[PDB]
């Protein structure tokens, strides 16, 4: 019997299935890019989803159902999530560096100007501004959800979290529409490259963050959270504010200043 | 009581040194390795053009 | 639960030193040989 | 006496010249005569014989300072063995030269080198220090 | 060029390379001194039976250990940066020559007046003439006027390469879409050799650079004859 | 039971053992690649007759030695085994995520071997610069398999860094401050912070290379307004932190080994050692462009990067002099691990000093992309990282296994290695000063003598590596079980015996505040 | 504006989380979350070291701000002394 | 800034719901109106086969290799111009 | 810090404590030999008499050994210390390591 | 038999260190003087002596007559 | 008119190792000038300095590609 | 909906020695076998693809 | 460190076998490839 407060985790197959899913996704992308086949990639995406589902299912079993998340364990998970977010900030930093490198020193092939000759940027006061209001609003509603949960108010937590998710979905649909309507593409030199890869990774993170909020929504429906213990909600809110801040930097840098 | 080094250290040292010197001298001089030393003081320059 | 102690906290057996020699020979030998056989492979394509 | 693995959390004996009085005695169990010797130790030590004094020491301690600090012939084995294996390496190099390496380029032929040397001197390669500086252009010979 | 058993830099052909040699001598002396001092103190710490194993106070000796290295670094940086800025100083060239890297050869363009350009390939080993240097000779050398300040401009028409001539202290990467400038001034006539210095694929080892430094009037006539 | 224990592990010691096994196997791959390099160069002319293959061998040599040998051994192996024991913690913070950091590495290595097997390999240099690494000069799958290998190794280490930072911050005894944790623990925490910040930037850069190769982006292609030099910045913004990541855990192990075999209870100048590692970590992010002094950068930028790079010698010097001050007054035990550490101190000092030579951008013009750089970094990596690894391996092998090595054999091994690596790399200084480029499969004839000696040195180290395998075999073959280890009062990782039970610190240590 | 419906920890915490929460209410620390406060450490007033077995590792920070911690096994029985500073510790098994 | 609002008589769920419905969603509604007033297709510009645009160094891994992933025939010309 | 005399005096006082126990005897000698000095005869005298009060002949001999060891290559120190201690050695019947043969390797 | 004199018994390690750190310093000075003399100054003098009366046209004519140039016969 | 042109002089607008924009600017300037002169009926001879500078500095293939793109209508700079 | 967390706590704390990833019941075993089958089978397939791609098609 | 005598002592003869086998495991496969290099450049 232990007399510390930390969690000795049962031996688990999900690290191995996650690692193999990484092998299958990357060898799958290689097979798709070079050997005209999606098969390995589809297996890898499937096993990756299965791994994520059973791994985080088990974390819920260990905490809500078995009681292993003492305050010391929760404190470690807080550090873990903060450090993960920091690494994701630095990943985006590389794409912002690429954007500023190319736009501050536009080469002759571009016309020696930014935006390049032949590029017609989107109007930042149209859908991009709408998207900004959508994500900012969702940062307000997720804050309402957090306070409702802390105050023990089930119905208003669910309402505010549902509004937050709806806004995340609205952003995603608006962005998908903008992608389709944009007269430039990812193959339109470094303007298209920086635009779609940086906003595209951001959009993937909006989808990830929205999925995490949806997990929290169903856990809330099933009463998993207490008014004082709900780190999965806190982590999803931190991740959601990160997604909102990355958007604000994209909006100012690429859509507005880069127009 | 005497250990491995008391009993065999002298012979290991002597044989190992002798073997090492002999085989490196052989490798260095007898099997056609071209060390390409400096020609200074060694090569008589010869007309080339 | 699991075996504890010397020779038991490892994923390979050390119960017989000659079987162990074989296993270590295959293990480190395969790693050391691999680049030579990759070079051979690339030379044999062209 | 006999040290056991399952004893690892108990105070243990060491012979270290910087830790002269270890945490336990070398020998804890005493025979009848050893018990009598420890009782005699409570009287004047002038009444102990030399042999009794040595046995008290060897009950308390395993090795003396002179024993634990003794030098050894190990360096002969280490140096001799290292030179053996370095010598064995040259066998591998002989094998490589014989069976792996083919001829080197024709530019190492003695006549090529002699011509190349003259041409390096004709173009005054390294004329301040490195190469042509060592050639006497007046006497047509390497400087002494 | 380098010569057999060489230990140090090729002899300087330009004043800047002369500067680098004296600066390297200065820095290497410091390198030897610090390396030797460390080896010696190691051996001193390891050669006594005397002991002192109780806690030792550190803040006095750490002042020495930081201040002395900081001073030494400053004594390296000052001459280092002086050469850096002198390399960058304006010197107004008499001639501009471009070189374009390719897999696997250099081309050269001298277009101040006429449209002069040519390719420069390694002489294959089987075609060397007696006395010529394996992997270093080219078919068409970069003829240049001696004793004059020359602007080199370096680029590439495919992958990265890098245009180097050690005895002149030159190494400038050759980047497609970019025109990198360096300056060259040879104090002497002769033949000065370099080799491609950014890995560029399977024949990176085999695209060398040969400068042929001659008087201006010979350079002018060679230039005319190469049109 | 075998699969549960060794494929589904949630145990920091068994995972550490997996990493040490993986790293040792990778070290044989990386050593064989290094011998093929030196065989090609060991006489003038061509050995493989295929310099694309030579370039692939050079590239893989570096990736294997860095990503599959040094980082898994130092951080995955010694870090997992030792960090929880040294702070009295019952395991790592995320013991199951820790297992995925391990299991991502065999697939990462598989992708790298696949890159060398398909097409003509990735003959790029481990820098993977475009356009050589782009889809025209390296068409086909090899470079993409290399990119994906790096992706997986990057995820493994980023998650590992999250684990180590969290464990070290959160799981010490409540009375133990950060200034009461051992220096090896500090060294792993700082390495983990460097990994956390730097690897995402590499991930961004190689992802951009992947999309330029497959999605028709042009981040690095001037035809679309891109710039090959942007890739170099992103790569080296990671790559300079990376060289400090490769050495910092070695610095931590060297502190412990020198303290232990000096018979001391503590290293000299603990807080200065912490200061020095933190300073090295911080400065390690503001110096990267010294890998780019010949790309055409403005002179004031080259002056700044010269100056900032030199600053690092100050905290590094404090650590060297503090190791010397730890020896001072010691009851010196001439164990094989002590020999490794003493070799480390001197050979690391030599390589750090040639690094200070290179920091001078004006001299670096002539030395860049020559064997002088190769000599600099093999003194810090093959006589620094490898000597710290061998020292830590010899020192802690009895803790991990319960068995002792034969010390005479281990001293013979050290002696052979010390001769071999110095014969290999010392002459490369002369080759660099005299202008021999790196990444070359053959050289002008003048360079023959030093290349011949360097290649003969490489075979001496081969003999040392073969003997190391025999020495490990002899220890497990003879089964001399550990009894008593000195200095446990200041080396907590030994206090649970050899090997420690599967679960340690189930009851945590008692440490009062006073 | 303000129904309920969210469980509290008192209602729904379980397992070790609940044990820690209940013990804390009683001012007890069975899972070692807090640092113990030292006694004067004399042989008369030894530091009392709880254990669920008959030995536990002590780490002694002999003086405030020492970076070196001194580690040793404390066994059931007579009090033992830190080998560096001599301050006394006694095991209290339970 | 203090913004221009100003409650903090204690913080809570009621205030953040107030901000959600009183400021945040009205802002979204206004930007949604603004956007729906300036929607409607911009007339596509003359096609000019600029070499820094419509990059093709390797075929795309889908379709005929020559269409971007969210190709819009109305506004995205191919390297050879707009589709028919 | 403290004078040499003050240092020596608090070590003499340490070993002279009449009811010094075995742990304190070991702690004292094992701490003392960490310092950069060979202990003065007056310190060694007090430690040897502590050995006598603790009925521990062997530790008395070991203390004489560690005096010789702390002198390192300074071969003149140990014979001087033994000289200064001979009245105590005679009084307490302590044989030196040399008289017991314990200086043989 | 005469008594032995009291030798120094304290600070022997520190005394040894002090003495040899000073010796290490004096050697480093002595080496720096040698290296400046055998290497650095030798180099300055070799380059200054070489160029003092150097005639670049005479050098060129020698090279040209030896046949080394593509541009000059 | 300031002939005896040898090569392009130092230009404080472009003092650094990267001379790409120097080549580009003088190419633009020459062709802008040649446009304004051929148009307004004047003499391209006043454009000569820019012509000599860009011919000295610019790689042949850059000039050639830029000329091709001007003919094609795909030159992305403003002339 | 109703709060059934207590029922789930009873289930996952039952003293049956099952590891947490199987302690839900037989559906866990099915999902585990599907996942591991896809991973191991996919990995073998990836090795087949490496073998295929390692040769110009010989 | 101290340790027990070997539970399964490895005699000098046994060590010569283990060492020889270890060296041959490294040397023979690489030696075979390198000996046959010229054969490979043929195809
Ligand atoms: C362990 C890995 C490691 C480490 C720790 C270092 C440490 C340093 N390196 Fe190293 N380096 C590499 C691995 C490493 N390097 C690699 C792999 C490359 C090549 C990458 C590639 O191109 O593939 C490289 C390339 C490289 C370059 C680029 C050269 C080029 O490509 O042209 C430079 C330039 O500044 C450099 C400088 C330094 C410096 C100043 C240090 C400093 O941190 C050293 C500080 C240490 C000391 C100075 C010695 C101890 C100090 C004292 C005893 C105090 C007194 C000293 C003085 C006052 C000077 N390194
Ligand atoms: C709200 C938007 C969400 C986007 C979802 C769409 C699918 C993309 C998935 C997201 C991954 C994000 C970054 C991947 C990089 C490229 C995608 C960029 C975003 C995007 O979707 O870009 C689209 C192109 O996608 C393309 O090339 C092909 C895109 C599909 C292939 C991606 C394969 C590469 C993945 C590499 C991942 C490496 C990760 C490493 C992490 C460590 C833009 O379409 P377009 O027709 O060019 O122009 C619009 C013209 N009307
Ligand atoms: C294509 C492939 C990519 C697909 C990605 C798909 C979507 C993934 C969306 C993420 C969903 C995460 C769900 C996590 C649920 C488990 C959870 O939230 O677990 C919580 C712990 O938090 C925890 O582990 C926190 C666990 C950390 C979760 C981090 C999630 C973000 C990471 C996403 C992957 C990033 C990829 C980046 C690519 C560039 C459980 O503790 P509590 O909540 O306190 O409950 C206990 C109380 O009930 C007691 O009273
Ligand atoms: C049990 C756990 C999981 C293990 C799953 C293992 C699955 C094995 C599937 C093998 O099927 C292959 O699929 C290829 C693609 O993968 C086909 O290639 C085809 O696919 C392309 C497009 O979809 C076509 O363009 C090409 O003609 C064609 O070669 C090909 O006929 C076939 O040999
Ligand atoms: C960097 C790596 C360093 C490795 C150094 C290797 C040292 C040598 C190990 C010996 O290797 C063997 O050498 C034999 C020759 O001595 C080869 O036999 C070959 O040559 C024989 C003699 O000509 C024939 O009998 C055999 O059939 C033929 O395979 C054999 O294949 C190979 O395994
Ligand atoms: C049925 C449920 C009551 C939850 C509970 O107390 O068990 C109520 C309370 C809050 C409700 C949700 C919130 O009102 C937010 C959403 C409002 C939408 O109009 C319907 C779905 C929506 C998601 C609601 C579904 C459902 O009526 C919920 C979930
Ligand atoms: C080194 N960097
Ligand atoms: Cu061109 Cu290397
Ligand atoms: Cu660096
Ligand atoms: Mg380079
Ligand atoms: Na070669
Ligand atoms: Zn204490």
Residue numbers in the entry:
A (entry chain C): 3 to 261
B (entry chain K): 6 to 54
C (entry chain L): 2 to 47
D (entry chain D): 4 to 147
E (entry chain B): 1 to 227
F (entry chain A): 1 to 514
G (entry chain F): 1 to 94
H (entry chain G): 1 to 84
Study authors write:
pmcMammalian cytochrome c oxidase (CcO), as the terminal oxidase of cell respiration, reduces molecular oxygen (O2) to water, coupled with a proton pump across the enzyme molecule from the matrix side (N-side) to the intermembrane side (P-side) to create a proton gradient across the mitochondrial inner membrane. Electrons for reducing O2 are transferred from cytochrome c in the P-side to the O2-reduction site, including heme a3 (Fea3) and CuB via the two low-potential sites, CuA and heme a (Fea), while protons for making water molecules from the fully reduced O2 (i.e., 2O2-) to 2H2O are transferred to the O2-reduction site from the N-side via two proton-conducting pathways, D and K as described in Figure 1. In this paper, the cyanide-bound fully-oxidized, mixed valence (three electron-reduced), and fully reduced (four-electron reduced) forms are abbreviated as CNox, CNmv, and CNred, respectively. X-ray crystal structures of cyanide-bound CcOs under various oxidation states showed that the O2-reduction site controlled only the Ser382-including site, while the low-potential metal sites induced the other changes.
In the CNmv, only the Fea3 is in the oxidized state (i.e., CuA1+, Fea2+, CuB1+, Fea33+-CN-). The heme a3 of the CNmv was located at a position halfway between those of the fully-oxidized (green) and fully reduced forms (red). The cyanide ligand of the CNmv coordinated to Fea3 in an essentially straight fashion, in contrast to the bent fashion in the CN- ligand of the CNox. The X-ray structure of the hydroxyfarnesyl ethyl group of heme a of the CNmv gave a multiple structure composed of the structures detectable in the fully reduced form and in the fully-oxidized form, as illustrated in Figure 2C in a ratio of 72/28. The structure of residues 380–385 in helix X of the CNmv exhibited a multiple structure composed of the structure detectable in the fully-oxidized form (ox) and the one detectable in the fully reduced form (red) in a ratio of 58/42. Asp51, Arg438, and Glu198 did not contain any minor components and were identical to those of the fully reduced form. The contents of the fully-oxidized form structure of the Ser382 in the fully reduced form and the CNmv are 35% and 58%, respectively, significantly higher than those of the fully-oxidized form structure of the hydroxyfarnesyl ethyl group of heme a in these forms (25% and 28%). Thus, a significant amount of Ser382 in the fully-oxidized form structure in these forms (10% and 30% for the fully reduced form and the CNmv, respectively) is not hydrogen-bonded to the OH group of the hydroxyfarnesyl ethyl group of heme a. In other words, the structure of the OH group of heme a is controlled by heme a, not by Ser382, the structure of which is controlled by the O2-reduction site.
